[PDB]
Amino acid sequence: SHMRSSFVVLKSEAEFNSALSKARDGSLPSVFYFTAAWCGPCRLISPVILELSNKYPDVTTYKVDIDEGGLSNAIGKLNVSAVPTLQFFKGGVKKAEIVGVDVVRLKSVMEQLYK
């Protein structure tokens, strides 16, 4: 289970631009989860994100399916070249990135940044 508002599935580039402005200009604690429907291993990450959302309720995590219409431009805006990629924002700036499946590091980075 999870809190509904803490996990957001973006559907348009306008939605992504809004979320990135929240993470930068708004200085809101934000995680961007870059994935693709055709990436099987990527699906290992989503359950862990939801599990951790309860521990860090101020954080909002955004799922960015790069195979969605328009969202293909998100990988250019944040310099993404592999799936899964997780990017972590705090204080209006990018604080960390995890490329590939690394669940242990995901748990450790969330604690390090947002505890």
Residue numbers in the entry: -1 to 113
Authors' text:
TRXo1 and TRXo2 share high levels of sequence identity and similarity (74% and 97%, respectively) and their crystal structures are quite similar and overlay well (RMSD of 0.9 Å).
TRXo1 crystallized in the orthorhombic space group P212121 whereas TRXo2 crystallized in the hexagonal system and belonged to space group P65. Well-diffracting crystals of TRXo1 and TRXo2 were obtained with one molecule per asymmetric unit (a.s.u) with Matthews’s coefficient (Vm) values of 2.3 Å3 Da−l and 2.0 Å3 Da−l corresponding to solvent contents of 46% and 40%, respectively. Their structures were determined by molecular replacement at high resolution of 1.80 and 1.50 Å, respectively. The distances between Cys37 and Cys40 Sγ atoms are 2.03 and 2.05 Å in TRXo1 and TRXo2, respectively. They represent the typical length of disulfide bonds, suggesting that both TRXo isoforms were crystallized in an oxidized form. Close examination of the resultant Fo-Fc electron density maps revealed a negative density between Cys37 and Cys40 in TRXo2, and additional positive density in the opposite sides of Sγ atoms. Refinements, using PHENIX and Coot in an iterative manner, indicated that this effect is an artifact of data collection (radiation damage), due to partial reduction of the disulfide bond by the X-ray beam during data collection. In TRXo1 and TRXo2 X-ray structures, the distance between the sidechain hydroxyl of the Tyr31 and the Cys40 Sγ atom are 3.76 and 5.51 Å, respectively, too far away for an interaction. The NH1 guanidinium nitrogen of Arg41 is hydrogen-bonded to the carbonyl oxygen of Ser74 (2.85 Å) in TRXo1 and to the carbonyl oxygen of Ala12 (3.50 Å) in TRXo2. Even though TRXo1 was crystallized at pH 7.5 whereas TRXo2 was crystallized at pH 5.6, which may explain differences in the solvation shell, TRXo2 would be more positively charged than TRXo1 in a pH range between 5 and 10.
